[PDB]
């Protein structure tokens with residue numbers, strides 16, 4: 001509930017973010033047509049998500065900063081940096097939906113799939129990335145942590161980018177080579193491609209804004225956060241198949257998309273000669289008959305029970321981790337975030 | 344000749360740049376496969392050009408910095424930042440060749456056109472962009488101008504990105520709307536898409552490294568450089584058609600690519616009802632017969648003579664500009680660069 005009480009002032013600040021960004025054409029009417037395009041890009045790709053990453057920046061801010069140092073301006077910056085995280089998010093989404101040729105995202109049609117856009121979406125994505133640094137300059141230009149944020153964001157893009165390469169190398173479009181879907185590879189892909197920018201970035205950003213720039217502190221927070229990120233992804237894979245669209249709010253397709261899901265990774269470590277063959281002969285197909293056939297092989301391997309088990313162990317681990325590395329940070333920082341992920 | 348005497352130590356430093364970038368997997372063997380991909384990306388897209396933008400950083404450095412302050416380390420940084428400019432260049436090229444669906448570049452096949460790559464080139468381009476900031480950190484992390492360079496590069500991407508949008512809005516793929524190919528639009532497209540990162544960036548970078556961070560000085564250098572950039576583009580358009588492949592080293596295709604060239608912009612400001620119709624009925628076609636037909640309409644309008652004229656006026660203007668805003672910078676900085684562009 002710590003988030004719901006913040007989501008309003010957050011999603012509402014979005015309107016200002018836009019105004020600010022699309023108001024440099026005021027002094028340069030020449031590039032006006034481009035700025036109008038930028039606004040359309042932002043209003044379509046940065047809106048429509050759950051804003052968890054963005055909100056985490058704000059929620060963490062209030063918890064790390066003293067109630068009196070949270071003046072109108074300090075909250076204004078936290079919202080802006082919260083939206084920069086969402087912009088980084090938007091940047092990756094637009095680009096990723098093009099590479100894997102997705103059809104929809106957040107319920108609507110993918111930006112590049114929109115008539116008239118197409119590959120020009122590549123430039124749009126690059127722009128969303130740029131606005132990040134334009135905002136950090138417009139608001140935190142003079143703050144003592146200005147350079148900290150810039151580097152954090154830049155590094156988060158590099159991490160995510162590297163993770164993206166890894167994933168493209170692992171499950172090529174048209175290569176059901178289940179031989180590379182190993183254990184370590186799955187954890188490396190999740191670490192760089194998701195864990196870092198989804199969990200470390202948001203909190204690390206709120207830290208630097210609170211003055212907590214200690215390499216040790218960030219090192220500790222990262223250890224907890226990356227572990228959370230890893231669980232989140234595994235619970236994402238599980239729910240993708242054995243989940244319930246009514247609750248999840250989306251139907252799974254990892255099996256059909258030949259994804260290096262956590263499920264298939266466990267299926268491969270627990271498969272007999274003939275079983276592997278069955279998978280190697282159904283993982284990827286679009287036919288629901290061949291897909292459900294795979295789900296059956298998973299259930300038969302009691303993977304869902306394996307998850308339930310791993311989940312219990314994970315919960316303990318994270319708690320053990322929070323009790324060891326949270327300090328000098330308020331355990332609530334991690335506890336709140338964790339409770340929003342687990343169960 | 345000021346460049347040729349530097350191009351060697353420059354293109355040779357490229358080998359070290361790579362080593363440095365692709366050596367972080369030493370402490371993280373996990374993302375090794377990705378780092379190997381990064382190396383292939385860099386060796387294919389950052390090499391094979393004339394390195395003018397990159398060299399300009401180095402050549403300008405030696406001219407702005409006192410001969411004694413040019414120790415082994417100072418030259419090491421100048422080469423690195425010179426290559427960052429080339430990496431920014433590579434980043435844009437890869438992305439642009441995909442958006443306009445080009446077939447070749449620098450003689451070879453476009454990276455995305457390479458079998459196995461395709462749209463994954465979108466991530467590759469994003470990586471080339473990342474290496475820029477990874478290098479600035481590995482070498483100028485401790486320099487007093489560190490933040491200056493980071494912002495300069497970030498801003499140069501935003502400018503280039505905005506210019507790119509403008510160009511995509513002006514000459515859409517499948518819209519021979521010669522109505523938007525105006526005068527001001529052409530200058531706005533060139534200013535953001537080329538002039539800024541091609542001419543201002545290289546010198547501005549060498550300035551910040553020399554301690555020249557004055558907002559006024561940079562403002563002056565920018566005024567000269569953006570004007571040079573504009574001429575360069577106009578001479579680029581002219582030579583694209585009325586040039587000579589033997590000297591230019593490339594055959595023009597602006598007419599066929601429905602490009603908002605400088606030629607067509609002048610052709611439209613100097614066209615009678617029927618003449619405009621002729622153009623409006625040949626500009627874009629692939630048929631050499633319909634293309635040469637356009638060249639004829641240009642020559643008939645004495646545009647080549649109009650260029651010769653504008654060129655003489657331009658040369659004077661730049662000289663008048665250098666004599667007014669060069670100081671306190673060594674006129675040779677701009678003079679050398681200009682002589683490499685003109686005639």
Ligand SMILES: O=C(O)Cc1csc2ccc(Cl)cc12
Pocket residue numbers: 050052053056198199202232337340341
């Ligand atoms: O929303 C996502 O896709 C992943 C994520 C990152 S921080 C955070 C906080 C709460 C919840 Cl529910 C999810 C997340």
Ligand SMILES: O=C(O)Cc1csc2ccc(Cl)cc12
Pocket residue numbers: 393395396399541542545575680683684
């Ligand atoms: O090389 C290019 O394409 C444009 C350019 C930027 S700085 C510079 C210096 C010398 C020459 Cl010949 C060209 C250029």
